[PDB]
């Protein structure tokens, strides 16, 4: 049962390089606008307390060097929207796919096309953690790489990468430049809150395990929602809401296992561990598959 990313070709055709001065990162070229993180206008002296309004007013259009492959795009206007820059260019991207911008909630999954100097390095699947970070592989120069889904012929852009936090996890914005979580694009001291396990995704993954023919971890018990949350939170699991219970309704009907019965199974798994066994090829409880992902790939 593999984590699958979406095919990245529709996003590859939108990646460009953006350079301002001696600072370079990736941009996203959709129609005649390039979107990129605003800290491309920072020097090494503007990393702790940059005033972006002041840094930007000192820039003209020709201070922004945008390269698509071997072509240099002409910037004919620029503005800042929250933490992203929007660079108007004089060519619409002929490879622009059908797209939309969406802001996601913690627990949601998406694919990341990690890029450097406007070129793709690889694609991986990840989830927005409950503490609003993501566990990516992102190196120096990766800012401006984007996260996305492609459920039905249309690319939904939901993440643009900005920064790395001291524990190595990553923080960024939606495509309107609003950060996920309480983070800011400054190198002043910041740390992500304690991360929790995405309970609704674990339950979806256990249903996936039942669907692929494994039932060894079920038991004959049920639980109330409140008793389940009292136990689960002792293992740093996110509380399960009635909303989450509704989300799982389809998978419960497919398997014949009530949602609160699967919750009883999860409580026992937390108490027992795996005892040398595995579930869907894993010795840990997996929480980066959503109920939607599981219905999708089953």
């Amino acid at each position: 049962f593999r984590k699958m990313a979406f095919p990245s070709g529709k996003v590859e055709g939108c990646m460009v390089q953006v350079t301002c001065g001696t600072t370079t990162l990736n941009g996203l070229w959709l129609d005649d606008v390039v979107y990129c993180p605003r800290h491309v206008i920072c020097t090494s002296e503007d990393m702790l307390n940059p005033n972006y309004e002041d840094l930007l007013i000192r820039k003209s259009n020709h201070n922004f060097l945008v390269q698509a492959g071997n072509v240099q795009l002409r910037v004919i206007g620029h503005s800042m929207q929250n933490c992203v820059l929007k660079l108007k260019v004089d060519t619409a991207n002929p490879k622009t796919p059908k797209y939309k911008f969406v802001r996601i909630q913690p627990g949601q999954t998406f694919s990341v096309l990690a890029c450097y100097n406007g070129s793709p390095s690889g694609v991986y699947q990840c989830a927005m953690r409950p503490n609003f970070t993501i566990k990516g592989s992102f190196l120096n120069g990766s800012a401006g790489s984007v996260g996305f889904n492609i459920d039905y012929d249309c690319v939904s852009f939901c993440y643009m990468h900005h920064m790395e936090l001291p524990t190595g996890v990553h923080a960024g914005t939606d495509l309107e430049g609003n950060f996920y979580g309480p983070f800011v694009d400054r190198q002043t001291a910041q740390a992500a809150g304690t991360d929790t396990t995405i309970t609704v995704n674990v339950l979806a993954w256990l249903y996936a395990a039942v669907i692929n023919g494994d039932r060894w971890f079920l038991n004959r018990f049920t639980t109330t929602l409140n008793d389940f949350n009292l136990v689960a939170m002792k293992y740093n699991y996110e509380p399960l809401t009635q909303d989450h219970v509704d989300i799982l309704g389809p998978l419960s009907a497919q398997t014949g296992i009530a949602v609160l019965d699967m919750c009883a199974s999860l409580k026992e798994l937390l108490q027992n561990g795996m005892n040398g066994r595995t579930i869907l090829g894993s010795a840990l409880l997996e929480d980066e598959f959503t109920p939607f992902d599981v219905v999708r790939q089953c």
Binding site: T22, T23, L25, C42, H170, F183, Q190
Partner: peptide, 9 residues
């Protein structure tokens, strides 16, 4: 410290 992940030179 947190790191902005543009390439700075």
């Amino acid at each position: 410290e947190p790191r902005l992940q543009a390439n700075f030179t």
